Amino acid sequence: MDKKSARIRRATRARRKLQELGATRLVVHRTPRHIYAQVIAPNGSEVLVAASTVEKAIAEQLKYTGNKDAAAAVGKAVAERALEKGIKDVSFDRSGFQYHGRVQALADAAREAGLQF
Amino acid sequence: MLQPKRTKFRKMHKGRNRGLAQGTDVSFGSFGLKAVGRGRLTARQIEAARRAMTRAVKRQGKIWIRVFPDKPITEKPLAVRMGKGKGNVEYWVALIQPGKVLYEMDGVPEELAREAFKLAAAKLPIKTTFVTKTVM
Amino acid sequence: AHKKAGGSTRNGRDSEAKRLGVKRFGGESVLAGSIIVRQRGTKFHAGANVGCGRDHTLFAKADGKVKFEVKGPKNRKFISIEAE
Amino acid sequence: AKGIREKIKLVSSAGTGHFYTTTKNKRTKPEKLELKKFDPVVRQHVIYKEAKIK
Amino acid sequence: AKLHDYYKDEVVKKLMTEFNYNSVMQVPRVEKITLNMGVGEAIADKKLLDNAAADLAAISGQKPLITKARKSVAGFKIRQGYPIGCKVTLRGERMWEFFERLITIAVPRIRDFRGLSAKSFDGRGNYSMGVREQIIFPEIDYDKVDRVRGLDITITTTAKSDEEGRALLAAFDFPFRK
RNA sequence: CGCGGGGUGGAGCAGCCUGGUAGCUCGUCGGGCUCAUAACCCGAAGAUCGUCGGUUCAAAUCCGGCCCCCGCAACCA
RNA sequence: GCCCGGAUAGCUCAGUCGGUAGAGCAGGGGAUUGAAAAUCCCCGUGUCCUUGGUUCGAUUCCGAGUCCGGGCAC
RNA sequence: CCUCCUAAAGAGUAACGGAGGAGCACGAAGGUUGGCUAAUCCUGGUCGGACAUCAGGAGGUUAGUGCAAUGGCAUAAGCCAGCUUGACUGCGAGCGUGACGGCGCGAGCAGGUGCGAAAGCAGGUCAUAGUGAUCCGGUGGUUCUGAAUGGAAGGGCCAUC
RNA sequence: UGCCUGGCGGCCGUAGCGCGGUGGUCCCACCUGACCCCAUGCCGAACUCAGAAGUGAAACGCCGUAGCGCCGAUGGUAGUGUGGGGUCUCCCCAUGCGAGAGUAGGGAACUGCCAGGCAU
């Protein structure tokens, strides 16, 4: 319902800044049964590298596909795949979510797994 | 004397009466009187004409006035030196351009309607000509 | 005689300050670029013409030529420069 | 000169001779300013004090 | 207690059978109960809104918000930003427990039935029982010889028409002078 | 022409300075004293602030227009 | 922007060397007269301006600042 | 001194031409993170049933904007909450602007700091009104000088009245 | 290869709105529970966390439908440059430029990216 209306309003404040500064975006998305992440090229061209909880390489071993430990799995995978393509100097996009639980666990796990912001 | 009941402003630039006006065609009534020459109409004249048709046509028909006088026009006081600010507003003017229909009627015979506009038009300040509705 | 029609509420006159100098197709680093003050709406800012002072002077932010665009939802006009 | 709101001096709380000048509404609340700001002489941020008084 | 358990088994089947809903979950549900004294009386004295909240809390089962005025001009020119009303808001267990203290106790303890003959609803399926005085209070020693003040009972529902909406509520049985 | 002041219960006056507030003395009406009136005493009633608009949450009040009353001014050769 | 000097009964003043809240008139009731003007009566109110401090305790005694009133400054 | 029109689709340019305001406010009404969205009317509503508070719906800003009008704004420049003092000191390419005085604008660099996980943001207020040249004199700082040497009145620079 | 679902776009109303149909063991909503970090000036509505069954209901995607929003020729019309005329408060003539509105008609979107399912 009306919180897809609300979320997009929160997002656009930050998100316009990062594309206007010309910086590569680690964008996250949350859903209660799936957690999603993408590193997008600064100008909206190619999505450089992504991880979700609906790819098998993440999905098979994890207790739930929409909890903080499942978020840590997505952050852990995604950073190293970005470094393998040579991507670092990325900035975080919290996409109308609070920087709180699954998202916080993921963003810390993404820097710790390797990503240099 | 008609006048707007309230306006945004009280005094107004002289302007030009340059063009040719939108109400070229009769369209409520069957036939009407159009301005041919351009000019200004002083609200009193619009009144004097409405009365004239009412004296002519009587208790038949409906009279429609399309022009409405609404540009205030100023006059300096009698016997005053020039240029101590802009004059006081005196009377209200409709700016009529060629082809503007002034008055329409219906609910009345054609021969009576030709006569009714002769009386009214003699009181107006521009040359004027009887206009009929038409299909397209 | 010399009869009098009196003073007025008058006008206090204006001022002069309103905008005084947009620039075009230049090359300077931080030219005023569009000093259309009193807005950020008449013009908006993007690319290396992310200027936008605290009067809405849309100064160039690096060397270039001003393109001018009309961009996105709500159809705002945007100043951006092509780098020279 | 101006308003009824009036000029005070905000004196650095380092022993160095430096001040900022600022206007403050004495009548509405005369509760004297603390506030931290730069002092260029110690070249660091320091609390400022007071309001043109002994 | 029993109300949400009763709604679950009975009112969902009943409404589904009577109105033949397209899928079962589209039975109308209970959405928040908001209570609310409003001002009562006395802006100026400026004590009484703080006494009003402390009376209201007991039968609310949570602290009252204390609403303050929007741009205002009614029985006095309140201006804006003054304290005025009261306001509560309930859902889930707190509301279902409340809705059992209504109905079971509070309504049969209103003598003349100012609380409900015929009463009609909003434009879609929401309703508002303005109770006149004082009902019941928690364990014991209820009356302290206070200063009256009724309150709005605005109960809300997810429902699509007021004709439908009164099949709901009525499935929990509604007043004896209705 | 122009400028400034005024328009309050049946009478004369007050409050008019970004404002929510109706007051005084007379007169009036009811009761009282007196053979009766006068006066005297007690009680009460009486203004939707000239009029229309505007700004304001709110206007007698501030602002604008018109009518009405007053003061001053309407020359210089 | 200084030096002064005041800030209380509603008022002006003042019992107030720190051991301790008043005179004169103001509003109500009682007591008398052609009500009244006018006697006599019993209540009229203050954390002495807000804060420091001496001390066995002190408002005032020693002090810092707000407002009023008076000088010289500019 | 500001805003609108006259003003002629870049500069905005007169007249005792038309129409309105300013001579300040603000220690949060500034910074920053985070969240949220308006006038008005209807319908139900315990006494303001002409207008409180409430709930529902329509609407879609018709509102807001410290104060005038014009421009503006939903990523809000609006409204609320938390922590706070970047209402920073040194400069400053580049520039619009004016006869000059002067006024506006500002990336970035150096010092130190606040907010935020970070990117990033911040050098007053969403902008344009809220003003005062110079002499003279005042207070504080500064080895810079201080009429024979050393000190000092005094003078200079800086802050500011 | 195709069809469908989600994220980030580009262009930014021919893209919108209405009305009707339609989709759920990919997925997405709603969804239940609030234990716990977290959270409400009261309110687990919101925010957040933990998750099974349920439902395609509302949201939203998709499709049909022109009712409306919206785009829109050609020609004529207004206006104007330059040069010339006159019955000059304004209009004509030469020739360059040429709208706004309105009419025919178009119209219910085109399209890049990475990500998952299903069919092939």
Side-chain angles (χ1 to χ4, degrees):
Chain A
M1 292 182 174
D2 309 68
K3 304 119 70 73
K4 308 302 185 178
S5 318
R7 187 192 66 82
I8 290 174
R9 172 174 45 67
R10 306 170 199 152
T12 305
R13 172 175 182 125
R15 178 170 290 179
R16 288 185 170 171
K17 295 180 184 287
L18 302 172
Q19 188 280 129
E20 293 164 357
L21 286 162
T24 298
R25 298 148 65 185
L26 180 67
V27 189
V28 68
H29 178 79
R30 183 186 68 177
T31 84
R33 281 65 163 80
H34 141 249
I35 300 294
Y36 201 3
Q38 295 182 59
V39 176
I40 313 174
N43 57 304
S45 54
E46 177 165 295
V47 182
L48 305 178
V49 92
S52 65
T53 59
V54 295
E55 46 171 281
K56 287 89 78 180
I58 292 293
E60 198 281 301
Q61 54 168 262
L62 305 176
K63 184 175 183 179
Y64 185 56
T65 46
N67 68 13
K68 291 184 308 304
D69 290 281
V74 167
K76 181 263 186 290
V78 75
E80 53 194 354
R81 295 177 194 179
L83 292 171
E84 103 190 347
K85 202 192 175 71
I87 325 166
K88 42 268 178 295
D89 301 291
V90 180
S91 304
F92 199 84
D93 175 339
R94 69 180 174 91
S95 205
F97 303 112
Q98 273 272 297
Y99 198 92
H100 208 254
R102 297 148 190 158
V103 171
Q104 194 152 205
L106 192 157
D108 288 314
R111 297 158 178 193
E112 185 65 294
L115 189 57
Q116 301 299 280
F117 284 66
Chain B
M1 195 185 79
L2 303 174
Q3 59 197 156
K5 299 162 200 74
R6 178 190 307 94
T7 36
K8 195 159 46 168
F9 290 109
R10 208 168 189 148
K11 295 173 183 68
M12 186 158 284
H13 298 166
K14 200 197 304 301
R16 294 295 86 94
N17 192 9
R18 187 56 55 101
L20 298 90
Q22 288 297 309
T24 51
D25 286 68
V26 164
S27 55
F28 302 103
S30 287
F31 32 63
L33 185 62
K34 65 170 48 176
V36 174
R38 77 171 78 246
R40 302 197 301 194
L41 284 168
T42 54
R44 307 294 287 250
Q45 290 170 354
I46 291 170
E47 201 75 73
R50 183 185 66 91
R51 291 176 180 148
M53 300 185 284
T54 305
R55 300 282 83 186
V57 171
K58 313 165 186 71
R59 50 153 178 160
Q60 288 65 239
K62 177 74 163 188
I63 310 185
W64 281 272
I65 306 182
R66 285 176 69 180
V67 294
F68 179 79
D70 57 11
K71 307 307 182 299
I73 269 286
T74 53
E75 279 194 286
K76 271 288 176 186
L78 183 53
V80 158
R81 279 291 222 248
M82 203 50 71
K84 295 284 177 286
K86 182 173 177 70
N88 296 342
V89 172
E90 210 51 65
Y91 56 89
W92 292 89
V93 168
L95 297 177
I96 55 170
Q97 323 202 300
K100 192 50 175 284
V101 170
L102 306 184
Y103 294 100
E104 301 185 7
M105 45 181 60
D106 184 56
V108 72
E110 202 272 6
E111 177 175 46
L112 217 187
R114 282 187 181 263
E115 182 159 61
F117 288 134
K118 289 163 63 183
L119 302 172
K123 302 183 199 295
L124 295 180
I126 68 297
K127 293 186 197 287
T128 50
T129 202
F130 191 103
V131 48
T132 291
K133 183 175 187 181
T134 70
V135 188
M136 297 189 85
Chain C
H2 184 81
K3 296 180 183 291
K4 194 189 76 191
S8 190
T9 293
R10 219 185 184 209
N11 65 61
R13 297 287 191 290
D14 279 47
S15 49
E16 57 279 346
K18 313 171 197 296
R19 63 284 157 261
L20 287 95
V22 314
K23 185 163 198 297
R24 261 186 305 259
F25 294 75
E28 307 75 9
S29 199
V30 164
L31 57 144
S34 175
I35 195 171
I36 306 177
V37 291
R38 304 157 43 182
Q39 48 102 27
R40 193 221 177 188
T42 316
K43 296 293 171 296
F44 247 67
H45 68 263
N49 207 105
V50 176
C52 204
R54 287 287 185 94
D55 65 352
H56 327 297
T57 300
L58 269 52
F59 63 97
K61 205 200 186 293
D63 306 49
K65 289 183 167 74
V66 182
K67 193 184 73 180
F68 300 101
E69 190 163 302
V70 185
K71 197 175 196 60
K74 309 183 74 70
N75 304 93
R76 322 188 137 289
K77 288 214 167 188
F78 284 74
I79 310 190
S80 193
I81 57 118
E82 183 60 270
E84 286 281 64
Chain D
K2 302 174 185 179
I4 67 182
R5 183 187 178 94
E6 61 195 293
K7 306 182 183 192
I8 65 161
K9 186 168 64 173
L10 279 171
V11 187
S12 198
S13 307
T16 196
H18 194 89
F19 60 88
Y20 290 112
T21 312
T22 191
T23 57
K24 178 67 195 302
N25 196 317
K26 194 175 182 182
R27 194 173 67 181
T28 61
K29 54 184 297 179
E31 276 58 67
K32 64 186 176 72
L33 298 174
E34 297 188 73
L35 313 168
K36 211 163 98 299
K37 193 159 276 287
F38 194 61
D39 180 300
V41 192
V42 294
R43 226 176 186 154
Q44 59 184 238
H45 282 76
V46 298
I47 50 170
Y48 278 75
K49 59 165 190 150
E50 302 179 9
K52 213 169 199 300
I53 45 172
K54 297 183 182 180
Chain E
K2 184 174 72 174
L3 281 293
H4 191 44
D5 196 66
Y6 198 98
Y7 167 75
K8 185 58 59 65
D9 207 63
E10 180 64 299
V11 180
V12 176
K13 296 203 296 287
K14 184 53 60 62
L15 300 182
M16 180 55 186
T17 43
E18 186 178 306
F19 282 76
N20 300 299
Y21 293 121
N22 301 101
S23 66
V24 196
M25 73 92 76
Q26 197 195 46
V27 291
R29 310 217 294 161
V30 194
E31 208 205 78
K32 59 183 185 287
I33 295 180
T34 59
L35 298 180
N36 194 24
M37 289 262 177
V39 63
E41 56 181 356
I43 169 59
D45 301 78
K46 198 177 179 291
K47 181 58 88 286
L48 193 66
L49 306 316
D50 300 282
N51 305 153
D55 292 326
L56 188 60
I59 61 92
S60 295
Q62 57 188 69
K63 170 184 175 181
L65 186 56
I66 311 169
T67 59
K68 43 171 60 181
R70 176 187 177 250
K71 195 69 167 176
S72 185
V73 192
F76 181 63
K77 279 40 178 161
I78 294 287
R79 310 185 68 185
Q80 188 164 303
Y82 285 10
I84 194 157
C86 278
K87 197 151 82 186
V88 206
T89 287
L90 316 172
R91 320 72 50 266
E93 182 182 359
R94 190 56 47 149
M95 188 204 79
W96 262 299
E97 227 275 15
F98 172 69
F99 199 62
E100 184 172 3
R101 307 302 169 189
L102 196 67
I103 311 301
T104 310
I105 311 178
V107 171
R109 295 311 207 171
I110 310 172
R111 67 205 206 275
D112 55 308
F113 284 70
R114 179 51 175 83
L116 236 176
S117 179
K119 300 288 281 172
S120 211
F121 292 19
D122 88 328
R124 179 175 63 110
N126 307 284
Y127 169 55
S128 295
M129 193 136 59
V131 298
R132 194 57 173 181
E133 300 186 309
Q134 304 292 46
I135 37 165
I136 178 57
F137 290 113
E139 184 61 72
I140 192 54
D141 286 307
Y142 308 133
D143 195 0
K144 61 194 171 185
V145 198
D146 62 294
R147 46 261 157 165
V148 302
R149 309 149 298 168
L151 56 154
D152 179 54
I153 308 188
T154 291
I155 171 166
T156 314
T157 75
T158 301
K160 305 198 291 173
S161 189
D162 49 298
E163 176 174 62
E164 170 190 65
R166 75 151 51 187
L168 187 64
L169 312 181
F172 305 127
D173 297 290
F174 249 60
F176 293 148
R177 295 197 53 100
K178 185 159 182 291

